[PDB]
Subunit: 169 residues, 8 copies
Amino acid sequence: PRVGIIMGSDSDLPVMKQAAEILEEFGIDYEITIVSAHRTPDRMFEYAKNAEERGIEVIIAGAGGAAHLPGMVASITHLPVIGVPVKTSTLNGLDSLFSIVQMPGGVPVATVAINNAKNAGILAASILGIKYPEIARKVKEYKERMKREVLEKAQRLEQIGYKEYLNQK
Amino acid sequence: PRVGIIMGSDSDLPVMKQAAEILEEFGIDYEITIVSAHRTPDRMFEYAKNAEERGIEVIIAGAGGAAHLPGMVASITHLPVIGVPVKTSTLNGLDSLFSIVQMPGGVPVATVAINNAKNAGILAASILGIKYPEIARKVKEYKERMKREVLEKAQRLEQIGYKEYLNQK
Amino acid sequence: PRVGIIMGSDSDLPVMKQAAEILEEFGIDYEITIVSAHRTPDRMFEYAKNAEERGIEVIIAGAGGAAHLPGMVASITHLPVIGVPVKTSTLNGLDSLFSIVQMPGGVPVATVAINNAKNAGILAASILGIKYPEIARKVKEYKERMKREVLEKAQRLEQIGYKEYLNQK
Amino acid sequence: PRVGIIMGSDSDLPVMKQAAEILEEFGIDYEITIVSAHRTPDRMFEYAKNAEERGIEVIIAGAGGAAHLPGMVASITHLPVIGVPVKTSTLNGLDSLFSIVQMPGGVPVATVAINNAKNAGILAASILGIKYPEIARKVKEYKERMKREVLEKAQRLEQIGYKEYLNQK
Amino acid sequence: PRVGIIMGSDSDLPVMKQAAEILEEFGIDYEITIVSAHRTPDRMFEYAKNAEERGIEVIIAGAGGAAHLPGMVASITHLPVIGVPVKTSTLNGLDSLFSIVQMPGGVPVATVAINNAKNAGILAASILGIKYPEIARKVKEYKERMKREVLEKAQRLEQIGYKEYLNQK
Amino acid sequence: PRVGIIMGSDSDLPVMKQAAEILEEFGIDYEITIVSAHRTPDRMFEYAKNAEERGIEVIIAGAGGAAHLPGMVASITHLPVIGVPVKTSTLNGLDSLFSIVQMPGGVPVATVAINNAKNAGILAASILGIKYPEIARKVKEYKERMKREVLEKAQRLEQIGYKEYLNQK
Amino acid sequence: PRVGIIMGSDSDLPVMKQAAEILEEFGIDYEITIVSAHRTPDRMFEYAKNAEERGIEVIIAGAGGAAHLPGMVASITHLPVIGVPVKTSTLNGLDSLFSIVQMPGGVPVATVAINNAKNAGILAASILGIKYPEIARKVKEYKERMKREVLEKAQRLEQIGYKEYLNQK
Amino acid sequence: PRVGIIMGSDSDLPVMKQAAEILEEFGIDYEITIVSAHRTPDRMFEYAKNAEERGIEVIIAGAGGAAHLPGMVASITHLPVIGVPVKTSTLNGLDSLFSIVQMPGGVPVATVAINNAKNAGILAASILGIKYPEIARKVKEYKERMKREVLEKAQRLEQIGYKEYLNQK
């Protein structure tokens, strides 16, 4: 099981590392690299064409602004492509979101929330989990952990009250 | 291989049938039914909890307005959930899109374009294709067909010119 | 008279405490806890189903992003549910607002301004006030106080002038 | 139990009648009239001031564009005020929504979806239901009916299939 | 010649003082005070009704969020009312702008840019200038000064170059 | 007393005639013509420069899309300029509104609602009314008529009910 | 002198033909064909790479939704690329506009108005006109014609009045 | 070969200097100065009219808010005009973008991304490059450099990993 995590700019790396961190938590092997739709277009084409042959099963692609990388990758490969819209300073990622999610009929990108590379990681795991029972188990376990974590927070708030909860937060 | 296609309202069925049509084109088995997050919440919970056990591997969920169904389904199941934002008369589906795509960290929905259930179908196939080589082949073949279809249109436009192309279109 | 104040994340607590503070000012009893639509969905269902039986008469629910908690609570309980859209870093709470206010026909949420949990508190009091004359009196008195406070500010500005008013502000 | 339904323009009546229809379904007494914030401001002031004394317990107010009526009513009365943003031809009710929902601290309006006067009716009933057990029962029963109605639609879709469902729809 | 400058909150005073400063530059007499549409509605009504009798000829009104003050003032008085939309932390004044500029037919507010109370001052002067030739002259002179100021900046940039211009800026 | 009504395109005339109709109702003399910022820029400059000398006291300017005409006119003349944003097919006049209302410091345009040339007419009258007591009286009388008209509608709705009101509407 | 006009879908041809019509009016030679970024990506790459060698000097590219074609073409060729955002049914071309205009640093697209292929034609001519004096003359002449056309309309409106102008329009 | 870089305010100079820097990198001669559409309108007219005669072949114009400068320049000159929308504090440059890009039919502005004067510089070079082979070569070389730079970053990320890449970044 392997995921490719790509982004156009190393300015995107603070956000996109979040997908790597989740995948590491799940024990899922990945590569993370730079592929610019606009500055290295041939490299993008080659990456998308060859990903399947190299054992990549899901691609997570991040891009900001006029964010073409996920969609262009999905136009080339038959693999599932997940798009992370990266927040822009001007339009707060709305440009990124529309550029990725609004793919015309024929070529989908699986779009997640602006700046939410953690969720692109979890979605990649959920996709992998239909094929790899071990990964399905890891996702189930993750969801139970998240539940337990909220239950503990709720219990604490109910026990110490908002004033004290905030003073310690 | 099985996909569940759900929607909250039969008003969503004109759009959501597009996912069924694609899946039929690919020979992928599916069920299509109504599950309302807001009017049948227990039914939604039960659907999401039991989908895996029944052999469903991907869920495609459509919702308009304050569109909670995809996200609530994804909160319950570990399966990949694809969200189709259905166009609203007031805000043209922008409310639908934000309600689906902006899932907080922990629980992803794979969001596609407003009203683009055809793309939710194709994405479901691409996801299935990592497990089922026959389906991967069908997606590859679909992409080659789409290519050939554009090449034929381009050739025709270049041969008869825009005036005549439009007169016959 | 009792109000339930819920939120999905303890990150929402700085905002949501504002509803608690108002209710305390009015002498209205409340509980405040964490209930995550997406990470503890069963807990949400159970909270909404049982609130009436426990004497809760109004629920104030806060959520950010794809903000499903108020709407899902309102789908389950017949009690009035007030939704506080919590500001997001990316879309400044616009995603939150659309996710809450745009509830389809059948299931309303009483939506107030982005990040305005103080107003969810006051609205809960106004609702309670139709049943509890003491609370109606407290709301009337609050409105008279707010009036008197503005009158004093106006008098001061007119007496010392904007320059000095700002220098002391 | 009594609800006041007001709107600034008789152009709003096609939408606002939806609240009257729901209230009639629930057996809740109401008045429906025209009160223009901008063309009859004294009338608005007088309506808001005197509503409580006349036995009105909830006000439903509709307005489009720069939609001030709900908020101005809520500034005057201590009663709960529900705001229906009416769709505008230019901005599709976004102007209406912001004008109503974004009330500053101190004065809430309970805002529902653009053009959704049906939901303002149901919310008024849910509010009344905390005081009047008969009304609480009517809301519970309404929610069970909505559930049963979706279950029947789902069963039908599963039995006759989407093609036939749409042909009869 | 007299202008009334009003605002709902002393939080608006940093912005609204800009109108006072311009008027002072033009030698135009004004009053500046607090009038809250939502917290002192009777005071607002009284202010608008009596402004003409007191010699006020133009009203400049600032408001943020669900910004009703300019429009409500204009509903009551026949005097020209200029609306300053004050920037909100959540929606950056877009809510303010729609609440003010989108007045339905019958009752106009003269709307200027978000947070641009300086321009409300200049517009008030331009309005006064049709009646008071001295004020018309002051506005003409202001426009010539603004021109001369830009010409001097342009000459400087052309003489010292952008690097040095920025180093001194 | 004289108002100049200008627009860039005769496509704007259906909307802009509304200002002429109001002015005619008030007995205010006006001219209405075409002045294109983008196709006849010299004509625009000349119109703005000479309006005062010809006895024009207020200019009403309409423009759609990148709507520069009001702002450019206001940059040249010291007279008050009122901007009507004309609705566009693509962005429903939002582009028009931002292009007009967001004038930087120094040069105001009095902006009214998208497509609301009727309100530009009334605002022009309110402005004229500070100088011409006869016009002030006409505006006062107009506001009383609008009030009486709403009172009659309200009485009718209360007398015949919504069903019948709508059947006759 | 030669311009390439490309679009991803023959659904874009009604809009994009407008650029061809202008170019024909100016006597500028062009080709018009279909090149889909998403369905024929290799064809797009090849088109962009080879355009210069074939004598193309400006490319006009139209795309709707997640509109990647102009930007991807500009990433490959050093030629000036003009982007026409094509209106979408859901978001009225706002998605198209952001996808095209918001190109990150390094790779520009010359973006014109949503659906305004006529302006992409004129811009292509203005660009060509710096090299070809005959084309510069044609653009100058076009601007003089547009001026004369507005002057004639203005004269007519002033002569027959708005009522009659509209009756004949 | 010569480019004119203009802006309305010296507040725009931090952004607009980016176009100068690129042009300097390409060895392209330019002038940079202040031309205010709204404060020096005659100067704007004169600049646009005379640019061709002075050897200017492309104009780059920056403006914020109601950003009329690019469009007004393009209305006057037959030269290609590139518009840089400058970010505003309130609406983050969305007002700027709509004011520039949404030019009606007849008069185009070549619009680039909000605050992206670097791209206006590169576009000016691409335009110049159709006439000046030396400049075409410089743009080709720039694109190859950008490619090589991304390839080196990608290699580094793949060699040292994201943790270390970020620690050194």
